[PDB]
RNA sequence: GAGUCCCAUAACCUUUGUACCCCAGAGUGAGAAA
RNA sequence: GCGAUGAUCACCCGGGUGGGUACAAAUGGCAGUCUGACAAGU
């Protein structure tokens, strides 16, 4: 009903942070992507 | 163990882990339609078998990795699938809709058709219709209403086929997902300009486009256009 | 009055529309958005349900062709009582066909009506009472397969999976019939161990037990039908001087049941053999004329499907059944086999010496041609003409190949 | 001839390995994703987070962009070097397949010389050596 | 005194069960093509052979036929009503009369093996009592028959020491920490019964 | 011969048979149905040419199915005798395949016809 | 031109399911309970 | 109210992992279906 309090708007936003940092670990770093992307194009071509 | 996780679209899962792949739950456990790998994971614990979805084989799968915002295919919906060469892509759609949903598979060629019939027995929710999609009045009896109309027909006059079937079978505010191959329509001009025409053609046919996605690197000069059917 | 013709996998639904010119109103989308409005506007006139699937396929094909079925005629016959009524029909072709019947109906098919069929069929399960959504969705699945088989021209006499099961089954029968025979030698052997050395045929061995149960019976029992003269006297003499011990009727009755089981297993193995021949004579007869049913059946099974074998080049069909020696030879840089599974073909047997290698190449190449006509022919006749012509060319090639003599004359 | 058989067999084995290996991996999409908006003002104010209803970093993840609603024991660096290895393995499969192809072509070119016919050696400025057969029909 | 009958009937009882299972599995597939659902409805393979013998072609559906197949097994499971409904509606492709002929004849074959196997199982039980009543009573007719087969003859079994007899049936757990004690205790008593039977 | 499809017109058939003859001289041509079927499996075929006049035409109807799976262009020429003379053999050849070789001296001509065959398909 | 004849109608390895096991073997050979 | 007719003799948190024997299944792996224009007669 859009009746969020400020506290309600704070607890939910932590979850968004919480699960994101969790999926960040499975979403993975940027550096290995740099080598991984170079290997990827080689296979596709 | 592989950690199966949910995905933005309902009925789709990613077996995240060391080897990460797009995955759908198997409607008919213990067999693979076209030799894809199968993964089963225990959940409280009961093992539920899954099937791998290969982007290079199914264009609908190639759309997912692109990050299509809205797919009108979701569990418990009636879907009309045009251009059912075989069960390479239909089986996965049947998995997403689930037992409550149904899939109306339409194909023309005889030889692939017999393969499609060979699968439909294993999947009760799939209703195979071997007929030409250019004359929808033929199979009007065998098809209910459908929340989405997904088309892979690689024809120069595909836009007409979508309009005819959509006028007859698609609900208002329903889904329309189209796969376009720029080479088949016009090879002279770049792949972008062909797509812009196909978007314009749909609009004249009372279909409002929502988003457009190119399918590289999975295939070259292909794009998926997602639109909604505004009859009003 | 306004009528709407609706086609369903359940059957034909007729709907009287309250307003005669519903098809002429431009707000139909709004009028028919809800089940109640559709129910209020449309009322069932006559519903004749589809009694059986066979009727359903016949009725459906009529719709595809646009012909008026008798079922459609009879349900339409009832509503004649209304003079000057309008019929709303989904497709022009069916409307024209109904218009030819001369009924007292003004048949209408227009783009405006598409709204009405859209609304009605959206709320059809609610519109039709007693039929749930699951039942309708199911019966469509059965009807779709029934029409799908007809359009594909699926025929019960042209499924290769029966070959694959039959040949796999036939091999098992031979082993199981073998083992039961080895023992029926042993088990009745305890009573009379001399039989097997004289008679080796299992069915011959079993039939002996049935005719005579005990060495005592050997004197008056006649084995002429089972054994020739010189053999039958042998068991008679061996009967009296036997080393084995007497057995009870309880043992004999049970050994008879095994013996009765051997002959039944022999008879059915023949029955399966003839049945496999009949199947191979209808699914790929051009192959049967050339290679033979037994070798023909094994070829289909090994590739896993008639189509898959068709796509194989002639070479692979030559060495189909000897992958082990082949792929071992290829990796170790040694000469490769020649024959594979075709060695048991009759024509290769007739050849001699190195001619067998050449005939295998000739027979395999002609095997592919006869096969690709069986698998990929649309209107193939059940005659085997192509194979017979192929058989002649192989027979001629064998003659000149064999007619040659290496030795100088 | 036997050398050609042996080399071709190894090449076929690796094509199947490469085909199986490619299926196991997943490759991130790289394509434009246009969005259509009716009003020019909606266009100017467009922001990916608002349209997708996600945190900003989740927008850039193409495969699994989760709307904020859904968001509400192996060391990863080790899991990485293994994933990179799995990709490193498939390219080595592609390379060994390609090398076996070149070896198999040159060997075929030689076997054509061994066979009967009339041929001329033509040398390019680059030094490439090729053989052109005369236009004589085979009996 | 002869016990070779016991050694040989047991070698049939297992072989029949292997074949009756295998052939019945093939009846399942062949009739599965014409109508896969019934394989799910009646898991019991023997009943399936009998039920297939009656419902040859699924198109044949009558209330009288429903009563007949209702008589087969029991309607408590509800399969009798299920089969008619699924019979009316299924994806099973119809097979030829010749193909139907083999399924029933092949199904008829599986029936005979089961019926003979049952008749044999009675014969072994009868013979075990007459040959080795002590051993049969102690552990059982079938198990005692197996033990005689392992040792090779009732005479050989008696000649063996108690410790050897325990390991003679230790690969199939014929006689079977407190659990171990009863096995060894039972192992001796088997040797005791065997000696009485043999001599 | 309705099953033979696509069927090259008079103008195109000349260009194909020109590439075939050039291919044969450089030993870049595989002759016959059974050789062509292999090169599809090994994936070294630029495109396949076919003889519509073959009786029974089915003996080469397996190749179109393989071509669709592997995405290899194909085309039918009206006469088998002509194709044989084009290849450089004494006998009727009902099907032929041009092997892939990116270093070949006639690569450009092969692609030009391949582009036209794709269009026709 | 060219190994059917070392069962590709197969062997071995991996996964799943079922039924069991976590003692010694030419087993030991007088304790156990209190 | 005993016994020579036979006494005695792996891991982790009530639960989960590790190992071992036999049987069945796998469209799971090893695993990739030979060459390709001359031959025979006078």
Curated annotation (Swiss-Prot), chain C:
One of its GO terms (cellular component) is nucleoplasm. It is found in: Nucleus, Nucleolus. It comes from the Eukaryota. GO terms for biological process: box C/D sno(s)RNA 3'-end processing; endonucleolytic cleavage in 5'-ETS of tricistronic rRNA transcript (SSU-rRNA, 5.8S rRNA, LSU-rRNA); endonucleolytic cleavage in ITS1 to separate SSU-rRNA from 5.8S rRNA and LSU-rRNA from tricistronic rRNA transcript (SSU-rRNA, 5.8S rRNA, LSU-rRNA); endonucleolytic cleavage to generate mature 5'-end of SSU-rRNA from (SSU-rRNA, 5.8S rRNA, LSU-rRNA); maturation of SSU-rRNA; protein localization to nucleolus; rRNA processing; snoRNA guided rRNA 2'-O-methylation. Keywords: Coiled coil, Isopeptide bond, Nucleus, Ribonucleoprotein, Ribosome biogenesis, rRNA processing, Ubl conjugation. Its main location: nucleus. Residues 283-403 form the Nop domain. There is a cross-link at residue 281 (Glycyl lysine isopeptide (Lys-Gly) (interchain with G-Cter in ubiquitin)). One of its GO terms (molecular function) is snoRNA binding. The keyword Ubl conjugation applies. Interacts with SIK1/NOP56 and NOP1. Interacts with the trimethylguanosine synthase TGS1. Component of the ribosomal small subunit (SSU) processome composed of at least 40 protein subunits and snoRNA U3. Belongs to the NOP5/NOP56 family. Required for pre-18S rRNA processing. May bind microtubules. Present with 34700 molecules/cell in log phase SD medium. This is Nucleolar protein 58. The chain holds residues 1 to 409 of 511 of the full protein.
Curated annotation (Swiss-Prot), chain D:
GO terms for biological process: endonucleolytic cleavage in 5'-ETS of tricistronic rRNA transcript (SSU-rRNA, 5.8S rRNA, LSU-rRNA); endonucleolytic cleavage in ITS1 to separate SSU-rRNA from 5.8S rRNA and LSU-rRNA from tricistronic rRNA transcript (SSU-rRNA, 5.8S rRNA, LSU-rRNA); endonucleolytic cleavage to generate mature 5'-end of SSU-rRNA from (SSU-rRNA, 5.8S rRNA, LSU-rRNA); maturation of SSU-rRNA; rRNA processing; translation. Keywords: Nucleus, Ribonucleoprotein, Ribosome biogenesis, rRNA processing. The keyword rRNA processing applies. It comes from the Eukaryota. Its main location: nucleus. The keyword Ribonucleoprotein applies. It is found in: Nucleus, Nucleolus. Residues 108-139 are annotated as: Disordered. One of its GO terms (cellular component) is sno(s)RNA-containing ribonucleoprotein complex. Involved in nucleolar processing of pre-18S ribosomal RNA. Component of the ribosomal small subunit (SSU) processome composed of at least 40 protein subunits and snoRNA U3. Interacts with snoRNA U3. Interacts with EBP2, FAF1, MPP10, RPS16A and RRP14. Belongs to the UTP11 family. This is U3 small nucleolar RNA-associated protein 11. It comes from Saccharomyces cerevisiae (strain ATCC 204508 / S288c). The lineage of its organism: Eukaryota, Fungi, Dikarya, Ascomycota, Saccharomycotina. The gene is UTP11. The chain holds residues 101 to 250 of 250 of the full protein.
Curated annotation (Swiss-Prot), chain E:
It comes from the Eukaryota. Changing residue 165 to A: Reduced growth rate at all temperatures. It is found in: Nucleus, Nucleolus. Present with 13500 molecules/cell in log phase SD medium. The lineage of its organism: Eukaryota, Fungi, Dikarya, Ascomycota, Saccharomycotina. The modification Phosphoserine is found at residue 153. This is Nucleolar protein 56. The chain holds residues 169 to 392 of 504 of the full protein. Interacts with NOP1 and NOP58. Component of the ribosomal small subunit (SSU) processome composed of at least 40 protein subunits and snoRNA U3. Required for 60S ribosomal subunit synthesis. Belongs to the NOP5/NOP56 family.
Swiss-Prot record, chain F:
Keywords: mRNA processing, mRNA splicing, Nucleus, Ribonucleoprotein, Ribosome biogenesis, RNA-binding, rRNA processing, Spliceosome. It comes from the Eukaryota. One of its GO terms (cellular component) is nucleus. GO terms for biological process: box C/D sno(s)RNA 3'-end processing; maturation of SSU-rRNA; maturation of SSU-rRNA from tricistronic rRNA transcript (SSU-rRNA, 5.8S rRNA, LSU-rRNA); mRNA splicing, via spliceosome; snoRNA guided rRNA 2'-O-methylation; spliceosomal complex assembly. Its main location: nucleus. CDD domains: SNU13. Changing residue 55 to A: Impairs binding to U4 snRNA, but not U3 snoRNA. Causes pre-mRNA splicing and pre-rRNA processing defects. Changing residue 77 to L: Impairs binding to U4 snRNA, but not U3 snoRNA, and causes pre rRNA processing defects and an accumulation of unspliced U3 snoRNA. It is found in: Nucleus, Nucleolus. Changing residue 80 to A: Impairs binding to U4 snRNA, but not U3 snoRNA, and causes pre rRNA processing defects and an accumulation of unspliced U3 snoRNA. The keyword Nucleus applies. GO terms for molecular function: RNA binding; U3 snoRNA binding; U4 snRNA binding. The keyword RNA-binding applies. Belongs to the eukaryotic ribosomal protein eL8 family. This is 13 kDa ribonucleoprotein-associated protein. The lineage of its organism: Eukaryota, Fungi, Dikarya, Ascomycota, Saccharomycotina. The gene is SNU13.
